[PDB]
Subunit: 464 residues, 2 copies
């Protein structure tokens, strides 16, 4: 990996576009005005991509060649990178300040800032924009995942009286549905800020390498069937597949996909009649989890629950909501996103079904159907020093007031009523509020402030 | 990278779930039910992740450890992996057959197949589903991009005599809008199947390492300003910023973002009056490219063109469409996707503007807004051998006919009228439809057939 290469190609030419005698470029990141945002992921990028000796003579040579053919011209500035190699032993003369990892922060607030610490490296601030802006993805995943937890929290507490096992209510099925291997690890780790359930163990490895956990089980999964594992038995032998699978996993939880041919036949006749004797004997810590995977998500879940309620003992909990026996649950792992999740739990509630009966899985929508625009994650220059004089800078496009950026040196503060305010134009120096909530996390090639994933999770906790 | 870790965690348990006495699992990939897709990206995955000695004693031990805690139980199949290590020196006993890289194939067709070559490794076929299915992404990016090229082609041909410079009409701005560094490389490579413009040089690195090309210039970019290099001058000094940038890049094409404060003032007063004398002196090989970046994308382009047509000499084409001077062009890089691109170009046509005036740029919509659901990319088991008997296998959910999978052994064939058919149930063995269009590309740890990026581009050409 070459950091000289890991930027928007046109930024190669930017060192020549700044006002002459510019010694300082100061830039910031915000989720421009999902009213709250989980700040997560910078620490990964800092350690993996920016830390330590990132400049070498070889990497400078490679970039020279690569940009020579890309631009069909020598626009690449060797001198600027030679300077960093020679004066700082390839360590980047940059200071990064950020709110704590896991922080839940209202939109339109400064989340991190970037400035050069050496006047010669004024151009460096915006060179690393591209790599740092990719922090939008872990942020958006963690945020969207948290918003789903809120809906589940509301309805679980409504229908059961507590939040027991909330952190297991949404499983990450996103591995195959993401754009790459690196994305799966990043996105799975972000989901894990909020829940424990994941089919992507690369997320666990990212957590341990870059954050660290104390607790013994950072993320979990259970044995589960897939379509090939049922259909391989042949159309006429679905019961045989079911019986074989639950006996192989008699002592542990097992998820079994039940819609290969006819979900409602599988629930009523196979699970509820033919194999009913093998279900009712199961332990509370080893339920059968039936997984429908097609049709309208609400209509299916409702009819599934109706069928099971007619074949198995149903209790009514203290909140007046119907409950399956402890050895039998449902997972809805198809068509679940923040919108449909809400419709399912509400529909369940309306039909007097407790949310403890059903857990959820999401894939493409949880990890892939997300963009920069969702939270308007943006990096902008707000402050420069030219001819030894500070200048507050900004954009303010005439046709779009939502695209206006903040001016001058920024700081984040706690207000008297416990809310947040970003102070612009260096007004943080007035000390009318407490201290700036941003900490220096990176300075001169070194990570200077870090958080465990135990701290991240704690920071991202719901407010109950 | 450990291939034992790069699967959906539940698949670790599937060796215990297939019918006893299974010696073969045969699975296929399709874009189920955007009527035609570009098959691109499998070669990358095969070379990076699947070829050679991918199993070592250390990787088996790591997986053992990782999976023990993830499952709270020792379900990981150490026996199967040790067999591959010991018998095949860590090389995977699978055969993969695929349509040529770059192939444009209608929906509903088999694009690749996977099966084990050793009876003991029946479980291996679907172990690698997850990694292989991530093919969806370069496929979907290659397809959506090709579809955008078709719109541009249609309208360029309509308003101009021809297709000159089509391969430069859509620039990839997606680097900061994608989920990771790896995605940025894969996605930019996929765009480069159809166009030449990219700001992500990682796309070019992927090309050369994994496909290779004899073209001396596979991807390009030009000098471009960003908001920071304009705003850093101060609001009162936008003209100074413009003048400085165009003079620094007097002899090469330069893109200059012009909406910092007021796009329409920039075009009418700054470019059109104060700096007009610096623009009209430019070479045809070195135009000023004005970049609006806010407001309604069609309304802004139309007003920009109207303004510029009033300050600069306009000629009418042989096709009757209006044309800016060769030293002056526009790039629209905000809010562009397949739907809005069509609306912009149609609105331009209605106002008698040639498409040669405006080129485009897309970011998150081009490389990130896309999902596996867009082309229904899916991997399914279609055939097994149990007790030495072949079994044609499929799923067919009662509530969703669109989710039914294909049966038995598959082959892709040219029909007499020049179209495509996928033959199911081994029917390709009746030589009624010519040779199988799928070729073995991987067998027993070796890539057996590979394509240059020159072949990919040729294969993916538009049919004019």
């Amino acid at each position: 990996f070459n950091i000289l290469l890991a930027t928007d190609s046109y930024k190669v030419t930017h060192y020549k576009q700044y006002p002459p005698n510019t010694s300082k470029v100061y830039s910031y990141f915000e989720c421009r005005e999902y009213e709250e945002t989980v700040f997560y992921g910078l620490q990964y990028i800092l350690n993996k991509y920016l830390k330590g000796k990132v400049v070498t003579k070889e990497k400078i040579q490679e970039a020279k060649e690569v940009y020579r053919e890309h631009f069909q011209d020598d626009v690449f500035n060797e001198r600027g990178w030679n300077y960093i190699l020679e004066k700082y032993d390839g360590h980047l003369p940059i200071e990064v300040k950020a709110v704590p990892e896991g922080s839940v922060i209202p939109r339109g607030n400064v989340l991190f800032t970037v400035e050069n610490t050496d006047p010669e490296c004024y151009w460096l601030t915006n060179w690393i924009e591209t790599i740092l802006v990719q922090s939008w993805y872990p942020i958006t995943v963690a945020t969207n995942s948290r918003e789903q937890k809120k809906i589940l929290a509301k309805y679980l507490l409504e229908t059961s009286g507590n939040l027991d096992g909330l952190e297991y209510k949404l499983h990450d099925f996103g591995y195959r549905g993401v754009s790459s291997q690196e994305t799966a690890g990043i996105g799975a780790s972000a989901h894990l800020v909020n829940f424990k359930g994941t089919d992507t163990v690369a997320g666990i490895a990212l957590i341990k390498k870059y954050y660290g956990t104390k607790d013994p089980v950072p993320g979990y999964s259970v044995p589960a069937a897939e379509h090939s594992t049922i259909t391989a038995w042949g159309k006429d032998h679905e019961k045989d597949a079911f019986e074989h699978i639950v006996t192989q996993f008699s002592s542990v939880p097992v998820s079994v996909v039940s819609d290969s041919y006819d979900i409602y036949n599988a629930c009523e006749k196979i699970w509820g009649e033919d194999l009913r004797h093998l279900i009712v004997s199961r332990s509370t810590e080893a339920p059968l989890i039936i997984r429908p995977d097609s049709g309208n998500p609400l209509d299916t879940v409702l009819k599934v629950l109706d069928i099971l309620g007619k074949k198995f003992p149903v209790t009514e909990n203290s909140k007046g909501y119907k409950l399956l026996p402890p050895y039998l649950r449902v997972i809805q792992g198809d068509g679940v996103d923040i919108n449909t999740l809400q419709e399912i739990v509400e529909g369940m509630k309306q039909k007097k079904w407790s949310i403890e009966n059903v857990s959820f899985g999401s894939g493409g929508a949880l990890l892939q159907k997300l963009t920069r625009d969702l939270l308007n994650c943006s990096f902008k220059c707000s402050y420069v020093v030219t001819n030894g004089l500070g200048v507050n800078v900004f954009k303010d496009p005439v046709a779009d007031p939502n695209k206006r950026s903040k001016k001058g040196r920024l700081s984040l503060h706690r207000t008297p009523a416990g809310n947040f305010v970003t102070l612009e134009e260096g007004k943080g120096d007035l000390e009318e509020y407490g201290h700036d909530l941003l900490h220096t996390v990176f300075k001169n090639g070194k990570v200077t402030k870090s958080y465990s994933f135990d701290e991240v999770r704690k920071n991202a906790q719901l407010n109950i």
